[PDB]
Design an enzyme around this catalytic site. Structure first.
Site, mmCIF file in Angstrom:
data_model
loop_
_atom_site.group_PDB
_atom_site.id
_atom_site.type_symbol
_atom_site.label_atom_id
_atom_site.label_comp_id
_atom_site.label_asym_id
_atom_site.label_seq_id
_atom_site.Cartn_x
_atom_site.Cartn_y
_atom_site.Cartn_z
ATOM 1 N N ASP A 44 2.057 11.302 1.628
ATOM 2 C CA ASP A 44 2.401 10.467 0.484
ATOM 3 C C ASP A 44 3.666 9.666 0.755
ATOM 4 O O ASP A 44 3.863 9.168 1.871
ATOM 5 C CB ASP A 44 2.511 11.380 -0.750
ATOM 6 N N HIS A 85 6.073 10.366 -5.948
ATOM 7 C CA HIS A 85 4.765 10.990 -6.097
ATOM 8 C C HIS A 85 4.597 12.183 -5.169
ATOM 9 O O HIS A 85 4.035 13.208 -5.566
ATOM 10 C CB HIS A 85 3.648 9.979 -5.857
ATOM 11 N N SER A 259 -5.142 11.679 -8.350
ATOM 12 C CA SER A 259 -4.083 11.890 -7.382
ATOM 13 C C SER A 259 -3.227 13.109 -7.722
ATOM 14 O O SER A 259 -2.512 13.599 -6.843
ATOM 15 C CB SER A 259 -3.271 10.593 -7.296
HETATM 16 CL CL1 LIG Z 1 -2.507 9.525 1.203
HETATM 17 C C1 LIG Z 1 -3.274 8.568 2.440
HETATM 18 C C2 LIG Z 1 -3.544 9.147 3.660
HETATM 19 C C3 LIG Z 1 -4.135 8.355 4.625
HETATM 20 CL CL2 LIG Z 1 -4.477 9.044 6.181
HETATM 21 C C4 LIG Z 1 -4.454 7.033 4.396
HETATM 22 C C5 LIG Z 1 -4.174 6.461 3.157
HETATM 23 C C6 LIG Z 1 -4.417 5.021 2.917
HETATM 24 C C7 LIG Z 1 -5.476 4.345 3.522
HETATM 25 C C8 LIG Z 1 -5.620 2.967 3.405
HETATM 26 C C9 LIG Z 1 -6.735 2.250 4.118
HETATM 27 N N1 LIG Z 1 -6.430 1.952 5.568
HETATM 28 C C10 LIG Z 1 -5.275 1.012 5.718
HETATM 29 C C11 LIG Z 1 -4.983 0.808 7.204
HETATM 30 N N2 LIG Z 1 -6.165 0.295 7.888
HETATM 31 C C12 LIG Z 1 -6.317 -1.083 8.049
HETATM 32 C C13 LIG Z 1 -7.559 -1.647 8.307
HETATM 33 C C14 LIG Z 1 -7.663 -3.021 8.422
HETATM 34 N N3 LIG Z 1 -6.628 -3.856 8.299
HETATM 35 C C15 LIG Z 1 -5.438 -3.305 8.053
HETATM 36 C C16 LIG Z 1 -5.235 -1.946 7.922
HETATM 37 C C17 LIG Z 1 -7.310 1.194 7.743
HETATM 38 C C18 LIG Z 1 -7.634 1.409 6.275
HETATM 39 C C19 LIG Z 1 -4.684 2.256 2.657
HETATM 40 C C20 LIG Z 1 -3.615 2.900 2.047
HETATM 41 C C21 LIG Z 1 -2.442 2.118 1.513
HETATM 42 N N4 LIG Z 1 -2.405 1.908 0.015
HETATM 43 C C22 LIG Z 1 -2.817 3.078 -0.839
HETATM 44 C C23 LIG Z 1 -1.702 4.090 -1.125
HETATM 45 N N5 LIG Z 1 -0.466 3.417 -1.534
HETATM 46 C C24 LIG Z 1 0.296 3.746 -2.671
HETATM 47 C C25 LIG Z 1 -0.243 4.494 -3.712
HETATM 48 C C26 LIG Z 1 0.530 4.750 -4.829
HETATM 49 N N6 LIG Z 1 1.787 4.320 -4.978
HETATM 50 C C27 LIG Z 1 2.297 3.603 -3.973
HETATM 51 C C28 LIG Z 1 1.603 3.295 -2.818
HETATM 52 C C29 LIG Z 1 -0.043 2.433 -0.538
HETATM 53 C C30 LIG Z 1 -1.087 1.331 -0.429
HETATM 54 C C31 LIG Z 1 -3.502 4.277 2.176
HETATM 55 C C32 LIG Z 1 -3.578 7.250 2.172
#
Ligand code: A1JA2
Ligand code: NAG
Ligand code: CA
Ligand code: CA
Ligand code: CA
Ligand code: CL
Ligand code: NA
Ligand code: NA
Ligand code: NA
Ligand code: NA
Length: 472
Positions: A44, A85, A259
């Site tokens: 996280d 979080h 979540s």
């Molecule tokens: Cl926990 C956990 C474990 C893990 Cl292993 C992964 C995630 C995961 C996954 C993704 C998806 N991949 C992104 C990177 N790839 C790419 C592909 C093509 N082109 C570029 C990048 C592959 C796919 C995206 C987010 C990011 N997204 C969600 C969570 N976020 C927040 C949530 C709540 N508050 C603040 C932020 C941050 C923004 C996360 C979350």
């Protein structure tokens, strides 16, 4: 057994309830299981390792900062407390008990760490280094997030992260396999359908949805066939929420969403692993299937599968039951090695138009070492074009008659890009014999004259050929 004395434990209704609307965690504590010796990591935005209710259980070996590339996952403090979080989730798993501070974790004697990975650009490499953190020390990984829950995204782990999942379940934890616990998503108000999230749709993740205090499907829930089970979380403003540790050494009563459900599941899994440290990553999923409880969870799609278990796309097999998990873990016999039966179905491309049905009778690798008579996960790996993806609904019916929704209509999903070998997964036919006729249904749910072509349908069956129980 003496229950915790912490000041907010009475407010932790999903643990301390006397009304049968809880996760049955006191029963596991009273059997002697509190998480001792188990290590959990929260993937996280960081973890406040000096929180008065986390410091006693904090484990630097369960922690890393992959955003800034250092060992210290302390959150970045901001005026809006954005990076709180992971601290909330950590306390759900393993807040210290009987210390006069806040409440308690489900596994209040487990060790707890965090990977600071979300407070920065999340790349495939960042994901892989997080999932693969210290895999012979961390037992259980808890992840509450994934691709955007906008109801129009189809995305999953890229190559490094997928390799990290397979290395984790294969060689992690001394070869027993890392246990990856995942939230199924918060996209309910966008009509999101969670098999479009390749992290929760993975067989390697133990995916968890939410129920409100009064037993209803919360506004934020996503339905899908990949979900395994449910824990309580937040709902409407008359229903209570999750009570846990908060950033700046505080205590919150307003932790919410799916979540918040995954960390509670991770804690129950920690209790279960204390009860039998030899459980494999697949054993753990079997235990969840066998012990989870539908009772008093309201949904209009409860259906009995081929082995007599009730399943819902909102709840999977129902509410996790910690006392039942730890009881069944103790004498559990390790499941047989995982078999994989690959069945390429189509002999020609098929026009979809308004509606397409594909029927195929399979022998599930009869006569081969991958013969499966006892299904675990099943996938329909589909390649298709369509002019408006979100108008499609897709169902898969097993030989035993179990209708799995692989994809519900997603009104916001305007994509013309279709699905490129997307491995829609269902857990709803677990323990069924997959020999016989399978039926794939693809339907245009809109009145529009939509069009496209199904070019590949691979039915992928996982499971074994021994050890079945009498149907429920
Ligand atoms: Cl926990 C956990 C474990 C893990 Cl292993 C992964 C995630 C995961 C996954 C993704 C998806 N991949 C992104 C990177 N790839 C790419 C592909 C093509 N082109 C570029 C990048 C592959 C796919 C995206 C987010 C990011 N997204 C969600 C969570 N976020 C927040 C949530 C709540 N508050 C603040 C932020 C941050 C923004 C996360 C979350
Ligand atoms: C764990 O399970 C494996 C597979 O059944 C078995 O060979 C091994 O002896 C078990 N180990 C312990 C410590 O129970
Ligand atoms: Ca740092
Ligand atoms: Ca406490
Ligand atoms: Ca989603
Ligand atoms: Cl595989
Ligand atoms: Na999500
Ligand atoms: Na999963
Ligand atoms: Na049935
Ligand atoms: Na059959």
């Amino acid at each position: 057994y003496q229950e915790p004395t912490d000041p907010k434990f009475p407010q932790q209704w999903y643990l301390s309830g006397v009304t049968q609307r809880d996760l049955n965690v006191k029963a596991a504590w009273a059997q002697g299981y509190t998480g001792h010796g188990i290590v959990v990591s929260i993937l996280d935005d960081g973890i406040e390792k000096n929180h008065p209710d986390l410091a006693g259980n904090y484990d630097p070996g369960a922690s890393f900062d992959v955003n800034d590339q250092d060992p210290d996952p302390q959150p970045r403090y901001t005026q809006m407390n954005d990076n709180r979080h992971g601290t909330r989730c950590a306390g759900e798993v393993a807040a210290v008990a009987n210390n006069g501070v806040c409440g308690v974790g489900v596994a209040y004697n487990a060790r707890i760490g965090g990977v600071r990975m979300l407070d920065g650009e999340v790349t495939d490499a960042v994901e892989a280094r997080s999932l693969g953190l210290n895999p012979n020390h961390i037992h259980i990984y808890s992840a509450s997030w994934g691709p955007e829950d906008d109801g129009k995204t189809v995305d999953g782990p890229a190559r490094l992260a997928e390799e990290a999942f397979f290395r984790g379940v294969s060689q992690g934890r001394g070869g027993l396999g890392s246990i990856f616990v995942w939230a199924s998503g918060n996209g309910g108000r966008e009509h999101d359908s969670c098999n479009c999230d390749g992290y929760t749709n993975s067989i390697y993740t133990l995916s968890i949805s939410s129920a409100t205090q009064f037993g209803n499907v919360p506004w934020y829930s996503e339905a899908c066939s990949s979900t395994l089970a449910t824990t309580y979380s937040s709902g409407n403003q008359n229903e209570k929420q999750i009570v846990t540790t908060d950033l700046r050494q505080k205590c919150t009563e307003s932790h919410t969403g799916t979540s918040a459900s995954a960390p509670l599941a991770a804690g129950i899994i920690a209790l279960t692993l204390e009860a039998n440290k030899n459980l494999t990553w697949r054993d753990m999923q079997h235990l969840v299937v066998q012990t989870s409880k539908p009772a008093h969870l309201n949904a209009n799609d409860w259906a009995t599968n081929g082995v007599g278990r009730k399943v819902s796309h909102s709840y999977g097999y129902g509410l996790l039951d910690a006392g039942a998990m730890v009881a069944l873990a103790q004498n559990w016999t390790t499941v047989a090695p995982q078999r994989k039966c690959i069945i390429d179905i189509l002999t020609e491309p098929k026009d979809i138009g308004k509606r397409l049905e594909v029927r195929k009778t399979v022998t599930a690798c009869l006569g081969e070492p991958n013969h499966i008579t006892r299904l675990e996960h099943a996938q329909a790996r589909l390649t298709l074009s369509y002019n408006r993806r979100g108008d499609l609904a897709i169902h898969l019916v097993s030989p035993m008659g179990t209708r799995s929704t692989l994809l519900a209509a997603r009104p916001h999903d305007y994509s013309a890009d279709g699905f490129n070998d997307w491995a829609f997964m269902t857990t709803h036919s677990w323990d069924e014999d997959p020999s016989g006729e399978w039926v794939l249904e693809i339907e245009n749910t809109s009145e529009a004259n939509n069009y496209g072509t199904l070019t590949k349908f691979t039915l992928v069956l996982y499971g074994t050929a021994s050890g079945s129980l009498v149907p429920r």
